Every structure is written in C-alpha cells, then in structure tokens.
Amino acid sequence: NKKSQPGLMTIRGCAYAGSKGVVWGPIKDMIHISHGPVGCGQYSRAGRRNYYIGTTGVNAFVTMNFTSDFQEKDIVFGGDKKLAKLIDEVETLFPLNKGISVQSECPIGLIGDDIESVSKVKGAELSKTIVPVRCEGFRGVSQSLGHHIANDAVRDWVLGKRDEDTTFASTPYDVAIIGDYNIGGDAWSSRILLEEMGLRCVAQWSGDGSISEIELTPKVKLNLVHCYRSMNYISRHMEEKYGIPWMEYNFFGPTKTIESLRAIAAKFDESIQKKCEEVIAKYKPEWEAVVAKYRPRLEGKRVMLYIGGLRPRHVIGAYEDLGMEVVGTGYEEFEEFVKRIKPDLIGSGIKEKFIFQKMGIPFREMHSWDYSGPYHGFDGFAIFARDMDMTLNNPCWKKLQAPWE
Amino acid sequence: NKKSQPGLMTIRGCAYAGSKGVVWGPIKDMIHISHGPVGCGQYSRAGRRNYYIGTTGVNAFVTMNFTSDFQEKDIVFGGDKKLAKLIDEVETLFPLNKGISVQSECPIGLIGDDIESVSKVKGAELSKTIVPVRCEGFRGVSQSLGHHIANDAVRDWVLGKRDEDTTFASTPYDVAIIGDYNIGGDAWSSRILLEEMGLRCVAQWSGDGSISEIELTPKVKLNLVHCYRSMNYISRHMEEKYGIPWMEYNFFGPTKTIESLRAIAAKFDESIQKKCEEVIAKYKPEWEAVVAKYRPRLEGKRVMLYIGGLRPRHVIGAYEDLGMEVVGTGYEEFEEFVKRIKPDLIGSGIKEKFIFQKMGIPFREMHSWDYSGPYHGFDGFAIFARDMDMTLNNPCWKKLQAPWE
Amino acid sequence: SQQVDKIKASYPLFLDQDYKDMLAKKRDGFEEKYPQDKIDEVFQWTTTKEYQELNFQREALTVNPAKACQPLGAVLCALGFEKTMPYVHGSQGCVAYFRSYFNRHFREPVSCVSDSMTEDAAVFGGQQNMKDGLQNCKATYKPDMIAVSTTCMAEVIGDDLNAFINNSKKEGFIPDEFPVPFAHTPSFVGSHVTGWDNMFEGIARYFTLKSMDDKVVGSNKKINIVPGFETYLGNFRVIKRMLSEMGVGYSLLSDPEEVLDTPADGQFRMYAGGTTQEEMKDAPNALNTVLLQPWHLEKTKKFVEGTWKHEVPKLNIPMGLDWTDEFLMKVSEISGQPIPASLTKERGRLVDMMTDSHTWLHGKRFALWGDPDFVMGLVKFLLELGCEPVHILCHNGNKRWKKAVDAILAASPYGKNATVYIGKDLWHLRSLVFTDKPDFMIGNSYGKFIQRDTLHKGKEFEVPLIRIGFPIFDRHHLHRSTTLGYEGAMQILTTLVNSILERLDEETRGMQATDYNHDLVR
Amino acid sequence: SQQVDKIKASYPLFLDQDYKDMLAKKRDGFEEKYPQDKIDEVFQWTTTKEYQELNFQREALTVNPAKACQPLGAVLCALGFEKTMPYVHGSQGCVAYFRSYFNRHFREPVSCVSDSMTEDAAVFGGQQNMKDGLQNCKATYKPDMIAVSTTCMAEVIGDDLNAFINNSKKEGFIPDEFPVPFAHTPSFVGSHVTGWDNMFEGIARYFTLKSMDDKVVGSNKKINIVPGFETYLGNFRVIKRMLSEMGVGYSLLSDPEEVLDTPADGQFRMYAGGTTQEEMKDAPNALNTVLLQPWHLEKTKKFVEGTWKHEVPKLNIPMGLDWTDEFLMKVSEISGQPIPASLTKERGRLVDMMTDSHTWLHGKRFALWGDPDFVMGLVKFLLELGCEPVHILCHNGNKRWKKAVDAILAASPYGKNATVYIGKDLWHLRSLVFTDKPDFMIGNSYGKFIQRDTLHKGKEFEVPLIRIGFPIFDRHHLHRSTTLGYEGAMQILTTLVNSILERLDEETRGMQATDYNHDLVR
Numbered sequence A, B: 001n002k003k004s005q006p007g008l009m010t011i012r013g014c015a016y017a018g019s020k021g022v023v024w025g026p027i028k029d030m031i032h033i034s035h036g037p038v039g040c041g042q043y044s045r046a047g048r049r050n051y052y053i054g055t056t057g058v059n060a061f062v063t064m065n066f067t068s069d070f071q072e073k074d075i076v077f078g079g080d081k082k083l084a085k086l087i088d089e090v091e092t093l094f095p096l097n098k099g100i101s102v103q104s105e106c107p108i109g110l111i112g113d114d115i116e117s118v119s120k121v122k123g124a125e126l127s128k129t130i131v132p133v134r135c136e137g138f139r140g141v142s143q144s145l146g147h148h149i150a151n152d153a154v155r156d157w158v159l160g161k162r163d164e165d166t167t168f169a170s171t172p173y174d175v176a177i178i179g180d181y182n183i184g185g186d187a188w189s190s191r192i193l194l195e196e197m198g199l200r201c202v203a204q205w206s207g208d209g210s211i212s213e214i215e216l217t218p219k220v221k222l223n224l225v226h227c228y229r230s231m232n233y234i235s236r237h238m239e240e241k242y243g244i245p246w247m248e249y250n251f252f253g254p255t256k257t258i259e260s261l262r263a264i265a266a267k268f269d270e271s272i273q274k275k276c277e278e279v280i281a282k283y284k285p286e287w288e289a290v291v292a293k294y295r296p297r298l299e300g301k302r303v304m305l306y307i308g309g310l311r312p313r314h315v316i317g318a319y320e321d322l323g324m325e326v327v328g329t330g331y332e333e334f335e336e337f338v339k340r341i342k343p344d345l346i347g348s349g350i351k352e353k354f355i356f357q358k359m360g361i362p363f364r365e366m367h368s369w370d371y372s373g374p375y376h377g378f379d380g381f382a383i384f385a386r387d388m389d390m391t392l393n394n395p396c397w398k399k400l401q402a403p404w405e
Numbered sequence C, D: 001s002q003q004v005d006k007i008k009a010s011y012p013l014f015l016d017q018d019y020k021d022m023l024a025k026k027r028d029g030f031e032e033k034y035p036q037d038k039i040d041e042v043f044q045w046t047t048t049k050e051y052q053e054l055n056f057q058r059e060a061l062t063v064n065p066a067k068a069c070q071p072l073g074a075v076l077c078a079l080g081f082e083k084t085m086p087y088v089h090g091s092q093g094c095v096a097y098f099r100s101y102f103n104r105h106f107r108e109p110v111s112c113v114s115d116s117m118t119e120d121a122a123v124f125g126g127q128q129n130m131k132d133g134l135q136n137c138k139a140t141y142k143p144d145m146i147a148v149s150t151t152c153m154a155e156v157i158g159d160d161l162n163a164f165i166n167n168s169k170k171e172g173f174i175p176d177e178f179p180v181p182f183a184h185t186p187s188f189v190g191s192h193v194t195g196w197d198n199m200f201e202g203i204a205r206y207f208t209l210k211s212m213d214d215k216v217v218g219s220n221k222k223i224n225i226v227p228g229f230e231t232y233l234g235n236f237r238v239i240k241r242m243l244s245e246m247g248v249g250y251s252l253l254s255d256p257e258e259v260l261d262t263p264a265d266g267q268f269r270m271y272a273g274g275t276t277q278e279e280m281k282d283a284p285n286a287l288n289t290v291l292l293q294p295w296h297l298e299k300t301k302k303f304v305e306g307t308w309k310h311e312v313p314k315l316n317i318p319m320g321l322d323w324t325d326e327f328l329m330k331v332s333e334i335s336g337q338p339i340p341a342s343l344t345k346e347r348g349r350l351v352d353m354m355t356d357s358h359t360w361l362h363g364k365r366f367a368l369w370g371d372p373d374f375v376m377g378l379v380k381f382l383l384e385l386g387c388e389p390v391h392i393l394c395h396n397g398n399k400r401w402k403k404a405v406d407a408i409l410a411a412s413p414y415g416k417n418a419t420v421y422i423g424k425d426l427w428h429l430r431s432l433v434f435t436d437k438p439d440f441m442i443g444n445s446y447g448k449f450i451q452r453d454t455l456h457k458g459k460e461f462e463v464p465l466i467r468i469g470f471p472i473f474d475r476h477h478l479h480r481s482t483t484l485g486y487e488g489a490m491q492i493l494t495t496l497v498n499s500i501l502e503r504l505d506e507e508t509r510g511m512q513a514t515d516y517n518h519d520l521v522r
C-alpha cells in the first residue's frame, strides 16, 4: 500500500535501479546495456560495490557503462534498429563476453519498442543469450518490482538453459548462494565458511556472479538465500520445477553465523555437522578477542534500526555480540523523533546519511555499501567491530558546539 | 686581488663549500664528516647533483650528512675526544665504508684543535684511511682555496697509497678523468665516448668517484682534466712525481666534442684515431637532427657569458652549434648593464637566477646544476638543445606586462 | 582469519592464501572462464591501432560516456536560489540518482523532490501528481519557490508544464502568487549543462518576462553574473571576491555555494543563501550581463539580449592568464571601475609561479575531457604554460565549439599535435591513450579506470590521472577548489607541477637502479 | 644515443643497455666494490632491532640532522621589517648557504649581506670589516635599517657587536640615528628558531628599551602578534585575515610575506612591505602581545613581560580545532571584539570536513618531525582526527617541551602508542619506521630518503612521505600553503585524506589481482 506521496523527499529507487543495479549488474561476464537516454546508466555506473574477480573490459564488465544513449531521433523512430546495431558492435569490440542483457529505461516502454524480438532474432543469429528486461523505471513504486521483473527474466531466458543437459557431475553437497551481492566481499567471506564445512558452492550469483553459475543453480541440492526480498521469487519457482528446497542464512556477527551454520549442516548428514563444529571451534578465539577489544568501547550504545516496536522480535546479530542496545522506530515525523530519542547511530531505514550527519548522528548499517567490509562471516565481524568503534567514538561528533556558544 | 668588499651581496662560497662541496663530497664510498656546528653540513646536504651509483647508507654516502654537531661544550673543551668517539660510531654503524675524511668548519681552526693526530691515531687503529682537511670556511676569499686545500689532502693521504704496489695490470690505453663532478651525469656521458674510442678509463674521480679509483690514478698514461680551476693542482703534481702528462677536454656541443676527441686520440697511436673516427661518424646524424630541429628556434638569440670583451676568444661550444650569438660583459653596475643590453639569457657569472628572473631574463648555464642534464657529450647536446628552446621560447617571459598598463 | 591487533579490510584480506585458493576453485570449476592466455590475447588486442579504427566506427554503441542528463543540470541551477525547492516532474528513480550523484561529489545533503509518476500517469498524463505534489511539497518543506523540470518519462508522454501548473493554482492547490517557474529538460537532448541552461532561462522569464516596461538598462548600477554549471565552490567565491575587490556592484544569479557547504553544528539546514527573488526581478536594471560559461548558456543569451537589451560581451570563461585579463578589462570598461593594484599583483604572482615551474611543464603531453567551457579554458591554459594538449575530448560538444578550439590551437605553436573530438566517449579515449600515449590525463574520477587499464599493459605505458572536473568521487574536498581566475590558475598549476614531480619521484625511487636521479632539489 | 623526436634526460637515458654495460665495467674493474650479497646483508641488518639499539647509543655522531643553525633564523626575522637589510657578521660562506637555502624553499630572491671576515680578522678581530661593511651596505643597497647577527667564526673569537657598531657611528662610517640593532646568534647553541628569537628580541629592545616612560598599556588599542619562524606564507595571511574579520586592531611584528612573494613584471624589488619602524616603536602601547609559537619565543617573552608589562597569554600555536578556538576566544577577551558569525561558520565547515573524512583518518599511524610548536600543533590535530601519532621527533627540542607533548598525549585515548624523542636525528627515525612501521610520515623533503630506504626493503614496508614543514625543495609552491587556524587545518586534513586515498588507489590498481577494491567512490 505504502502511501509514499509526491512532492516529498525519499532516496527510493526505481525498477531500473532494482533490476540493473542489484540483480543483473553484478553478473560479471555479461554486458548489460542501459537501453534509453544517457542518464540512468551514468548515475548507476559502478554505484554499488558488488566485488568480483576479472579483467574489466575484456572478460568482466561490471564497472563499465554500455548504453544506447538515446537521442531525439531514437525516441521518435524507435530504438529497435539501433538495438540490433549496437548488439553487433558489442560482439566485435568485446568478443569474450558470454551474454548480453537489455535493461529498459523509462522511454522504452512508452514509445512502444519491442526488445523481445530483437533479443530472439539477434540471439539466434549470434548464438548468444540476449536477455530483454522490461524494467522501465516508472513501473511499480520501488526497486521491489524491478527485482521481481529481473528475476522472471533470469527464469525465462537463463535459468533453464541446461534442463536437458546431464553432463554435469554433481555431489550430495552441492549448494548455491542466491541473492548475495558480495558487497565489500560479503559473499566470499561467507562462501569460505560453507566450504570449510564440507559443502561445495556450485552457484554464487549476482555478486561475483557468472552466467554459467546461474544455469547450474538448478543442479544443486540446497539453495541458500541471503536477500529474500529480492530473490525469493526465483527461489520458490526452483522448488516447483526442480524440487530444490531453500532457506535463509545470515552471517552478521558470531551468534547468527554459528546459528545459521548449525542450521545449514542440519539439512545434511552428520559428517557436515561435525565439520561445522570444527569450523566453529577454529574461529571461537578469533571473535572472542574481537569482543574483548571492542565490547568495552561500544557497551551501552544505542543503535536504532527501522523496525516496528521498541526492540527486534529476535537477535539482529553483530550489534548484540558487541553489547549494544538495539532500539526500534516505535509503532508509526522521524526527524524530530530521532532528536528526542537521541540514538548513537542509525542502523538502517530512511537512507541518506548526509542529513543525519548534519544532525550529529552516525549512519553506518548492516552492509559495507560505501567504504569498508566485508561485515559478514567471522572475518567480517572484526571489520564491523572496528568500524563501529571508530564511528561511534570518533572525536568529531563531540565538536558540534563552538566553545563560545 | 679581487676587491670583493664586505656589505655587498654575492653567492660566493667558502673554502668548506669548495672542499666538502665539490672535491670530497662526490667520493661515494667514503663517509665525509662535517666537523663543527650543525649548519654547514645541513645547507650543503645533497646540494650539488654529483650523480653516482650505489646503495645509500650502506656502501655509498653522498646524499647523507654526517656531522659532529658542535655544542657549546665542544667549542670550549675542544672536539678532539669527540672526533675520536664518532669515528668509532661510524665504524660500527656503517661497516662497509672504505674511508673517512674530516672536513673542518670555521670553529675547528679557531679553537685550535688538532684533527691530524686523531686521523693518524684512529687511522692506524682501525686500519682505515682518515683524511683531515683544514678547509675552515674563513680561509681565503673563495671556494678556490678550498679546492687547493682539498687537493693537497688527496695528495698527502690518498694519492700515493699504492706507490709500492705493482699488482696493478695496466694497458697502453689507461686514462683517468679528473675533475668531472658528473653533474646530471656529465662524466658518464663523456666516459661513454672515450671508451667507444678504444680508451680504458681507470680513474674517474670526484663525480661517482671511488677511493679506490683515486689511488690508481697514478697508474695511468694520460690525465684528462675537465675542471682545471679546481683540479689543476693535483694534475701538475702527478706529472713530476710520476711523469704523467695531462690535458683539458671539453664535450660541450658537437664542435668541441669532435675537437677534443680528435686531440685525445692524437696523444695515442693511429688505431685510436681511426676508432675516434668511427665514433664521430656514428653520432654525426644524431647531432645533425638536433641542429635541424632547434637551430631554427634558437637562431639569433644572444646568450651573455661572464667573459672579458664582447665575444669569446674562441668557440664556447654548444651555443654556436645552435646558431646563437654569444656576447660578453665588456671590459669592466652589471644589473643596469644587462637591462641596457637586454640579452636573451645569462649563460654564466654572478650567480642567483632568481634575481635575473625578476628582471625577465633566463639563467641556465653550461652545466645541469639544477634540473636536467647531462649537457656534455653527444647525448648531452640534445638535452641541452631541448632545454635551451624551452627556456628561451616559453610564453611566460612574454607576459610580464599586464594588458592594462 | 583475523588478528584483532591488526585487522584487515577487503584489501588485503582477500589476498590471504585461504581466499586465493577458494577463489581458484570457484573459477576453475564453475565459471567456465576463458583461458588466461586468451584473456591476455584479447587485452593486448584492445590496445592496438586496429582496435582503435574499429572502436571509432561505432554508431549505435556508447561505452563509458562523459556526460549526465539534462534534469541533473536543472536541479543544480534551481538549488542556487533562496529557499527554493528543485522539483522534478517524472519518475522517482531519477531523483534518487540526482541526489545520490551530488551527495557523492559534494558530500552534502541535496534537497530535491519528485512527484513520483507511476504506470497510471503513463496513460492519463501526470496532471494529478503535479497537483498533489506541488501542495505537499509547499506544505512539508515550506519553500518560497519551486523550480520544476522534467524526467524523460514526462517528456515522452508529453505533459504541458505550463497548463498543469496553472490548473494547480486554479483549483487552489497552492497560492496564486507562489513562484512556480518551469523548464522542459529533455534527457535525450544535449546534456546536464543544457539542463542548467533551460532551467536558468525558465526562471529568468518567470520573474522578468511580463514587467519589462518598468526596467532601465543601468538603473541598479550592477553587473549580472551568470555562472553556469559550476561544481567547484571556489569558483563562485573567487569571482565574487574579485568584483568586490574592484568595487564593482554585482548580482550573482544562482549561487548554491551556501547550501552546498553548510556548517556542522548539530542542525540540518535545508535552505541556505542563494539568489533572492528581488535580485532576479531587478536583474534587467543592470548595466550588462556576463556569462561565465557561454558555450552552454546560449538559450540564456538569446533571452538576455532580446528582452533585457543587454550587449552581453563575448568573453571566454575566465580561466588562465589571458582570459582572466580580458574578463577583468571588460568588467572595468562596463562599470568604469579601474583594476586595483592588488589584482595586478595577483596577476604577477601567477606569472611568477608560471616561470618558477615552466621547466617541468614544458612539452608535457596531456589528454583531457570534461564540459565545453571548462575544457577550452583548460586548453588555453595548458598552452600558456608551454604544454602539449594531445587528445581533447568533449562528449557533449558541437561542431562550432570544436572550430573555436581548433582556432585556439592554431594561435599557438603548442597545438600542433592536438586533436579535438566531440561525441566520443571514454572507451574511445582509452584507445587514444594507448596508441598515442600522453604523459598525463586531466578529467574526472571515471578516468581512474583508464589508468588501471594502461598500467596493466606495463608500468611504462601507464597514464596517470590528475583529477580536475566533475564529478570527483574518489577524493575528498576537491570540490572546494577553484579553477577560475588567477586564484584557480595558481591552484591548477600547482596540481600539475607537483603531479609531474611526484611521478618523477616514484620512477626514481629504486635503490641502486634509478635513484641516481632521486634529487632532493627539484 | 638519442632520437630527436623523444629526447631523454639522465632518467631514463642512463638506463640504456650501452650505459648499463659501461657502468658494469667501471664497477667490476676499478671500484673494488663489496659483493652485492654483502651489501644486501648489511642493508638487511640496518633495518633490525639490534641495529636500532646500537643506533640509539650514539653520543658523538649525528647523522641527517633535522635542524639548521641560529643565524638562518635571524635573517628570516630581519627580512620581515620594512626596507631593512639582514647583515651577518662573519664568513661569506654562511651567507652563500643561507640565501641558497631560502631560494630553494621559497623560489624567490633573498636579500642578505656578509662582511666577509677572512684569516686576518681571525686574529685582529672583525672590527674593520664591520666598519667598511656597514658603510658600503648602507650606500650600495640604501636600506632604512640593518639587522646584524653573527656567524660562528665571529662568536668564537668573540667580537663585541655593540662596541663595533658604536665605533662605526663614532668614526662616522654611517649616520648616528641609522638603526643598527644586533643579536648574537651562536650556531653552536639551539637552532634556527632560537636565532629568530634572539634576532626579534634584539630588534624590539633597540626600538623600545630606552623610551619606556612614555608608553601606556592600551594606548594604541591594538594587539601585538609575534609569528616566530614561519615558512608558510599562508600563515601570515590567515592570521591577519581572521583578526581583520573580528574587527581587532593589530600589529604583526615581522612580516616577510611581501618580499617572499613579489610579483613578476620585469622589475626586481629588493624590499617589500614588512613591519615599519613606527609600528615597532609603538608596540608597547598595545593592549597585549600574543606569541604564535611560544616554545621558541621565550627570550622574547621575558622582554615583553619585564619591560612592556604585557600579560602575555599562555596560548599554544593556533593549529587544529581546539587551539584555534582558544586563540580566538582569548583575542575576543583581550580586545572586547566578539567572534563574528563568519568565523563560527568556518569552524563548522572544518568540523564538517572532519566528519566527512574521519573513516579514512581513524587509526592511521603517523611518524612526524619538525620544529617544536609546529610538531605539537600537528600532534594535537592528528589526535582530534582520531589518528595515532607513533614516533614524534623534534631534533631541536627540550625536556620541558617533551613533557608538554607527553601530557597532550595522555589527555587522549589516541596517544597510547606514541613516543616523543628529542635530540634525535633522521637516521634514528629511519630505524623506528623499520622496527615499528607507521602508515605515513609527515615532515620535510629530507624524509624522501627514508621512503626510498623503506621501499628498498619491500613495497609492503614502504612508508610514504607527506611533505609538511620546512624546508620543502622537491615540490613547488607548497610554501603558499597555510597550516594555522581553520583554513590551515582544512588544508592539512585534505592533504592527509587524499594521501591515504591515493596510496590505497595505488595498491588496488593491479588488474584481476587487487583491483577488486579499486572503488570509484571513496
């Protein structure tokens, strides 16, 4: 429902931001084309930190911005013949790409062009996977719809590419990490644990994603979902067409990491549950030293998250391990609300840290997003712990008032 | 005589600047100790660009500043016991040094300390060459005296170290480059030619100098002297005690380089004179292209040097090859003189480029000294040619007058 | 693993052997990656002449553009007026991006609203959203003016901003006298600078158009200053500082310096300083009007000349020595105020620095890009210093602009090897720096990727980047710099010389290898 | 060999194979060099703990000092007064070096004379030279004042400056009323800052000592400002700019900003601006006197308090946030003038920058050195930013000064790992950066050699240098910077953050290796 009315400020994104920005953009060996005017792609160019490993401009293209850069002519006569032409230029200038997706910008839907046909026809011609995505920005009231549209595209053009292929050599421990954007490296920092535990992560997509890995996702035994909000769609579908179960997992802090590691192992035999214990034993001292160092300097500090009520229904994760007091936003302003509650830092919700900074309040959430990371896994806890301490305790926040009034 | 009176400005150096600064400082494997207060050594620390090849602080020490840093106590009680102590510290902290010289600063002569004895006694003890130099700054009226004192020290404590040693395997082509400070690399740029010509440069000292090379100088057949003004002394002496002849040489521009190369070969048989020709042939096109490129943009430009009369008694070198008009300082002011003559650049004399710059006149002489180089040899001509053009023709000199008066 | 005493972030964390092996497995077994030999092969190919020729024959594909879209410019213009609220008619997505793009470059809050037109407005027009939108924004943020622009969605279905805005005053959603100037900012036309152009002009008309019979050229005895798309706070300051130094009265039309640099003392200030409405209404009574960045203030020019009757002088952006001379002399001639001794001394200190540094700057080859005025101004300057512009690129440039630059290059012996390109992107530029290598690059943060590319080819092919322009995301506080006048010329000269010097230092730091040239004095 | 189209200077010229082989021959056959394995062996040894312990046990040997000699300071002080000519009684050599040392740092002409005392004066004193010297200098350069100091030679034979100078007015070599203040500047005592101290005090007495009965504390209603040894022109400017912004009347005693930054227009100006004689004679009539750099203005303090009767406030150098606060509040209290809104906003913009950059500055370990006041001010600031000073060194420091710094480190949770050293040189510092590695170094050009040393050990051990202090020879125009007040705090903060950032960029530029962290946004 969300009555998010016009004429009001909000750093709320569009369907394009959700489709190109979080779901498709991260896929490293594909070339994503912002179809439409020059703006959208430029503003989103390397905006999110989905870490990956590759040789940019040769076999990986995440931080690049390919666009059809629509002029007046294209809006009037349609950009269909243009789409077909640029796809041919991409093929000669970037021969080592393993696929192309077409992220639609607002104009594409309005002037009624049909990118689906171009995809089918050029795809057949060049024997490549060309994925048309109708994520025009005006659609829906948030990135959410973009996620849903981006997921269906994966499903309809990529996911079932090898449904008649069996040359894949599977094991009883094949797992797939879906919905991890590898921000600051979160997914690598997680994938390390899951494999020290006996599991074989065959598919890790979006973050450091590979087109090839997406196509193998259906060949796994379990689906691990980090961000359900944007990948749940494709999760439910893989369970019906393939009967592959799925579960959430969260490695934010040692409590949740141990919890979720235990739970993952449970879905398997006992040898994995034993390995899971050898893993938890191995990192026990490491996070204890972290709590030993920072808990003293973070204890009693109140971090406010965007949750209903005054306290989370359960454990958020790392904040608790560091002896921090997590509060909520009540049951319903928001600017004055914070002034009257005077938290120590805003943990999430109603974005744009710069407004809060002016108000003397830190704003560093659950994910890296801007500068450090990873924040997940055991190695991520130390990083999160250090940053929390530096932000909360930095002397800059204690200088807002000039000594002469 | 030079009636250089007190109360007047002059960037004229002292005996210390001439001894530590040009004659001893360049010797790379020796540690030179500025004996006296902290100032002299700090101001001279890596002041001149005597290029060298080494591992500073381990086996080469040119750009370092070792000092006895005299406090009041030392001035009153004498720095003799201090000298003996620091020489011992140098031995343990810089084990790979091949000798120590002691450059006296003003105070040393006045408070009557005797560094000679310390040298002899510590030298005998550590089996090292310790060279005391009485180059106190007040002595004489210029660096000139410093040069003379620095040369005698070389003669008395280093030069004859192997007068009873014959294990040296000489050839009929052994030559020694004396007095080249390898500014910007001038000596390397010269040494290359002399060896492409059949000669074997056994001793190249001061610039990229080695203590070892100084001791072999007497084992050569010919002495090539770049800067006679500071090394003539030791040149005349090596001819009497050893009967080794010496000559000047100048590789400033192609004319002089060819001239001096011819003359050097003449002192030898005919095979060297033939090689000398193969060398001149090899570089002929290279300097012609240089004259082809810059002569057009430098032709007619008047460079003023500090010579008597209106024109040099002969060829200066590179300036002429580039079609430049060399003028003199007449037969006797000097500031207004230049304003009335309005040269295009001052080639030498009465130092401090900054004063002339304010007057709108370039000041870049015969040697690198400050930024580029080498300027000698054939490779040096191109470098000199390029710099001349950039300085003379740079648009900055044509902006001194604001367009609104 | 981690040692609490010396914690590691992603770098160097993921360089630990455990991560390296884990990544070797991921790749080898599931990514079906091309052989490393093939990858190097293709990479080597993208640095050649053959690839360049092919790269330049693109007609449909744009890779790594160097320009934003119109509404981005509008917002920056709007933001420069007192208590006004940039409002954008169209999708919410755009605004999310506009604010985010300025937050990153200015590291400050950016006020800006949308009337979030969804799917329904795509068929029934966005009339309603304009109504509620203007009302809630007038109520929630209590502004004194709302400058409206449009996202590309609104331009495609073609909504009439004038009517919509009137029908809003009609049904009484917002007062009648409440300022609501507008401008169509087509994202598929021109670039962000054009946006600033359409927005400024649209605001000038609203306050001036119908009331020109009471105006007299000379009345207020001031000089109108139109900055243009300026992202360096030091430029608004430097120009006000020089006019005030000559005793010239002025009115800087559009001054966001205040809101883009608000103090930090516990209070969030949404509005700050800016051009008051009065200064705008009285703008016609000025002696004349100077346009700091002409090449993208053409529409504004037409209106200032055909309505205010001002003989707008033909001046280039005041960058470098000469153009600051001209700007200064023409301002002296228009107001009668002479050039003060102080400005003559400042001109002399710049000339002093130029001569102190010319031996390091002379003959250095530079590749550059950015906006039209900024680029030509920087080209003019590079030439005054004896430098060699080699690849001048301006994505959002035109043929007239290019002739102007080509002429400036002919008027100097240092523009022999230069070539101006328009409508070309950074992927094109990438080829150029490989095939005809410059010593340095001058441009925005997006050039950091070209440096990483050239370095991969080898240390001797690496082309260092000197950050000047917009936007600059990977360095802090450079937006407080100044590129205009003598002050900005000094700051640019300093950045250039010390870059040459740092790079030289870096190449001569190797012990007993290249350090023979690691001079203390330079 | 050379290709005229792309000429090469010493670097990379001597890297050509022909030069490499020619140098391999020179070495192998005549230098009797130690085996490369021995050299690496010893080098490795000079980076260890054992070598450090040995290095710190030096008593007689000083290697790579971080301080100049007294007369150097005198000259800089003298140069700050109107039409005066720094004169140094002693050897010519010193002056050659003083001028050369300032030319390199300021890249400007430096006026200064010597009375070139030779061997004869070494036995009959330098009485005569003082006579002719004062006459010819008064005639040749036509100054209005001649500030005399002494080289170490004159101090050793012990010449009386007072008598000599009187016997000169006696025999009539120079007018009687012609100002000829003096000061003994023993090179073997203290350092260049003490020199500035003795020189300034010697000039204050000459114009004030005998005429104190006509003075009244408050008469001229101004505040005396004594800068101290300042080598950043931006500091003289920033302080005058803030006082003038509060409406406080002042007299900057000793202002070389003008002669050290003369315009370039074809004319050489030997004299420029500076403290007039009148301002000096009237200095006692001031409300009070503030000493910008107390730790080296002690002798001046004694005289200002025991002769002018001023209750000189106990203020630290105005660097960083807090100390600029105090300096400002105390100036408001002494003149009655309140702190203007503008200065409060500027304080807020600095706090804004501190919060915008704190995530990159926090926990960074720094080693630093320089002069006493500058160092503690920089230490205070590093602490306010959440940084970790680790090796604080001040060659020309004392035990009292060290306690003051140790206290400042105890008043913060960021000074835990710090250690202050005095009477130690850069060779000592070299060991420290090897055994207890910091992230960066802050100091003058002489630290470039320590960076080359650490890099030779390995890229991961390299300690980058951030040039701040005196002197700076290998970079141009950094002497126009500002380190004082809010303006200088902003400039220092910017240099620090962008250094962290450039270094990070450099380490993450390797393709498919470390570039996964080469973020566009930072």
Ligand code: CLF
Residues within 6 Å of the ligand: A014, A015, A016, A017, A037, A038, A039, A040, A041, A043, A104, A105, A106, A107, A135, A136, A137, A138, C069, C070, C071, C091, C092, C093, C094, C095, C097, C150, C151, C152, C153, C187
């Ligand atoms: S909502 Fe989303 S971000 Fe807006 S446009 Fe639509 S897909 Fe894109 Fe793009 S070019 Fe500029 S920024 Fe817009 S006005 Fe058009």
Ligand code: CLF
Residues within 6 Å of the ligand: B014, B015, B016, B017, B037, B038, B039, B040, B041, B043, B104, B105, B106, B107, B135, B136, B137, B138, D069, D070, D071, D091, D092, D093, D094, D095, D097, D150, D151, D152, D153, D187
């Ligand atoms: S003339 Fe020559 S440079 Fe002068 S001192 Fe004498 S040897 Fe030396 Fe040294 S420490 Fe300073 S600079 Fe002098 S006053 Fe004494």
Ligand SMILES: [Ca+2]
Residues within 6 Å of the ligand: C106, C107, C108, D352, D353, D356
């Ligand atoms: Ca900010």
Ligand SMILES: [Ca+2]
Residues within 6 Å of the ligand: C352, C353, C356, D106, D107, D108
């Ligand atoms: Ca200068």
